[PDB]
Subunit: 221 residues, 3 copies
């Protein structure tokens, strides 16, 4: 079941990438860079999850799905870039604020991988550093980045706020599931955690980019 | 023999880098970035192949030898080669960084699929191999499609030089997956020693040769 | 003692990052990018050294201890330090990103050669070590040659500050390969505990100290 679910994930990621490619042919005032980012995220995630389907992306008395971290270390910074470029749509880019989010995010993902390889108290030291990183990313998202979106007009700011809430809501689920599942307290079963880390990324990657790009295309008229 | 051939490779790469450094002192209207890229490619490749000569850049997986240092080489050197090609098409005009980074993304994936294919057994090997080939096909479509159209927009002389260098690179690049498949990593029709000679001779033309043809053409547009 | 010293290091790095964050709120004409670089360096180094304190960032290779977390630290922190230096020379003038990326390329290679040297036995160790030293020499040539000439082109006050920071960095940086060679990784004339103290004290001056001297100088060109 685990293998079949991961094949199904990869196929949906492929269809997502094709959809974003088609949209890019009629860009409706959205820069090509934003279409490219929306295509890379699902293609990279699909390839990583494919490695799990074929039984290569994990190792073993607990099973670590390391391919998830290889996915997230590329896909999550690109998602924060898409969010930041949304706030900055039609105005000056602030690359310092963008790269601050990339730096925080990559650290967050590495702390999670190390936490998964750790035993005892040490696991929860690393986990905690990752959570603090996520908190600061959320403060930036709803503080200075939202202020940039407001400075680009009410229509843009409204779309930014919607996409920020969408992403923020899905992102807090990852560390929660991690903690309740085998990697943490083990209150939830392996099969449960797998279903969560199949369904969340579908909404997190393909869903987010549909909502994000349609909103920006609608500002062309 | 295998060790000595890799020492010889590294020494030729060093001489290549020194030659490009000298050329950079009299740049003849070619930006410094293009000289830097031409120097990094052979220096990085030389260091990787040196690790093979010293017997560090390989290990034994079941009954086969994996030359993993090749992948450490190619993951840096091949994206820089596609950048040099893209900057050639864009010479005297606006840079399109989105198209450049699309080629880098495709290329890095292509090289990773090859490394994983080399570590795989049975059908799984050929799934990864196949994904890498599709990546290479899309790179070739970009090279002869949108990137060639950018070269045309920068004038007849430049477009002619671009087309020559693109064919040169395209011809050498299709040899890598072919050799991979016929050698030990694939069907095993060719011996280890054969594959080694191929992955010594091809990179010399692919790295140092390509950059000589590429840079001399661009320097000739100054006069 | 080794574990306690690494906790103390991480805590000092945290306080360094906080100080640079406060300074960034009243930037005094220094771009936000230079404050961000000064914050990333100590935070990344602190996290790496924390992994040593918890006993995860090292392993036993043959009969010696490799502190591999140091290399994970330096491969991110040292290129960012050379970037801060380069941006100091270029303060109030055109950025030369080709010269900046040349320093990053040299530096990353230098750090990788060190990691491979630490994993090597016999002559091979000293081949890799030597390639890293040559990289450091070329970085020093750039620092006191073309990069210092850019600083002079941005005026006497800036050039004076650049020269001070360049000497400060150059002085600390030559200590790393010296200590490496005298300690367990090399000839073994110095004890593990000695080497540890050196690779706790030097980075404090190398990271937090350098950025204090660097940023205060640039802020003073505003007053
Ligand atoms: C923690 C893991 C590694 C993270 C490294 C990320 C690098 C951080 C530094 C980036 C510099 C940002 C450059 C921005 C330039 C434009 C400045 C602006 O106009 O805002
Ligand atoms: C498989 C791993 C891939 C990692 C690299 C992914 C890169 C994606 C990001 C693209 C950045 C595009 C730069 C945009 C610059 C706009 C100006 C222009 O295009 O001329
Ligand atoms: C050993 C690993 C090497 C990885 C780093 C690769 C460095 C090569 C890239 C060069 C980019 C050049 C910078 C762009 C030039 C902009 C114009 C300018 O200001 O000079
Ligand atoms: C491309 C996306 C990244 C995929 C990487 C993970 C898989 C690589 C590991 C291959 C090992 C196969 C042998 C085995 O573990 O049984
Ligand atoms: C749990 C979620 C925690 C963080 C929520 C966001 C924090 C408040 C937004 C930033 C305020 C501001 O700087 O304007
Ligand atoms: C929506 C919330 C999902 C709740 C699922 C809990 C059951 C999983 C388990 O404990 O194995
Ligand atoms: C810079 C060059 C990059 C390539 C280097 C790879 C070498 C890796 C070294 C691994 C240790 C080998 C162990 C041994 O000597 O038996
Ligand atoms: C793995 C990374 C793969 C992604 C590359 C996608 C290729 C897209 C080509 C079109 C580029 C463009 O938007 O102009
Ligand atoms: C699309 C292009 C794909 C090209 C790939 C071809 C390799 C197919 C597999 C080769 C036969 C395997 C036989 C065997 O394992 O014995
Ligand atoms: C910056 C943060 C990264 C620091 C890197 C350290 C890697 C730690 C991995 C150790 C795994 C556990 C080893 C063990 O318990 O024996
Ligand atoms: C392998 C690890 C590589 C890590 C490299 C870290 C990134 C290096 C340098 C980026 C800094 C560039 C700063 C440009 C700022 C431009 C400006 O402010 O004018
Ligand atoms: C240490 C050596 C520094 C030598 C400085 C050379 C300056 C002249 C130059 O080559 O540009
Ligand atoms: C100042 C010089 C510090 C170095 C002298 C102490 C060496 C101790 C040792 O070799 O164990
Ligand atoms: C049903 C399996 C589909 C495989 C598609 C290819 C993998 C995703 C993109 C990489
Ligand atoms: C252990 C083999 C893993 C190979 C894939 C490497 C991808 C790393 C990207 C960061
Ligand atoms: C392992 C680290 C990989 C990080 C991925 C790179 C993300 C950078 C994307 C930034 C795009 C900026 C677009 C400017 C217009
Ligand atoms: C043994 C259980 C330990 C639980 C650790 C939870 C850490 C939460 C971190 C919150 C930081 C604010
Ligand atoms: C991986 C090795 C990288 C080589 C970089 C070479 C740097 C030389 C720069 C020349 C100086 C330009 C002025
Ligand atoms: C994970 C490994 C990633 C390797 C990436 C190598 C870097 C290739 C991109 C550099 C080329 C950019 C040149 C821009 C020219 C602008 C003038
Ligand atoms: C696996 C990597 C390849 C997946 C490609 C997805 C579909 C995109 C087609 C792009 C064609 C570009 C031509 C200009
Ligand atoms: C056995 C290995 C096969 C590798 C073959 C690589 C592809 C060969 C070239 C075919 C694609 C050409 C694309 C040109 C498009 C023009 C627009
Ligand atoms: C022994 C057989 C050696 C085959 C060498 C093929 C290399 C092709 C290079 C073309 C330039
Ligand atoms: C570590 C230093 C703390 C950084 C917190 C930044 C939060 C952003 C503030 C915006 C008002
Ligand atoms: C891994 C290290 C990452 C550190 C990033 C620190 C973030 C600083 C906050 C950004 C500036 C906010 C401006 C208001
Ligand atoms: C036996 C140990 C010998 C040490 C060799 C170190 C040489 C110094 C670095 C190379 C400099 C090249 C000029
Ligand atoms: C005026 C030309 C530059 C002279 C450089 C002097 C050498 C500096 C070495 C410092 C290392 C300690
Ligand atoms: C057999 C003794 C080897 C001689 C060692 C020479 C002295 C130390 C060389 C390394 C110093 C690094 C700084 C170079 C600049």
């Amino acid at each position: 079941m685990i293998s079949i679910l991961h094949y199904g994930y990869s196929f949906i990621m492929l269809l997502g990438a094709l959809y974003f490619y088609l949209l890019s042919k009629d860009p409706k005032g959205v820069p090509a860079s934003e279409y490219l980012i929306a295509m890379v995220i699902p293609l990279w995630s699909g390839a990583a999850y494919l490695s799990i389907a074929l039984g290569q992306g994990l190792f073993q008395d607990t099973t670590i799905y390391y391919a998830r971290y290889i996915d997230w270390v590329i896909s999550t910074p690109l998602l924060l870039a898409a969010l930041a470029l949304t706030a900055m749509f039609g105005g000056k880019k602030n690359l310092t604020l963008l790269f601050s989010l990339v730096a925080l995010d990559v650290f967050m993902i590495i702390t999670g991988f190390v936490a998964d390889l750790s035993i005892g108290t040490t696991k929860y030291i690393w986990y905690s550093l990752g959570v603090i990183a996520l908190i600061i990313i959320l403060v930036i998202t709803f503080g200075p980045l939202r202020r940039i979106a407001l400075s680009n007009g009410t229509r843009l700011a409204r779309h930014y706020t919607r996409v920020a809430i969408y992403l923020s809501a899905l992102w807090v689920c990852y560390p929660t599931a991690w903690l309740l599942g085998p990697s943490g307290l083990g209150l939830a079963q392996e099969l449960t955690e797998v279903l969560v880390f199949i369904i969340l990324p579908i909404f997190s990657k393909v869903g987010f980019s549909i909502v994000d790009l349609h909103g920006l295309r609608k500002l062309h008229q």
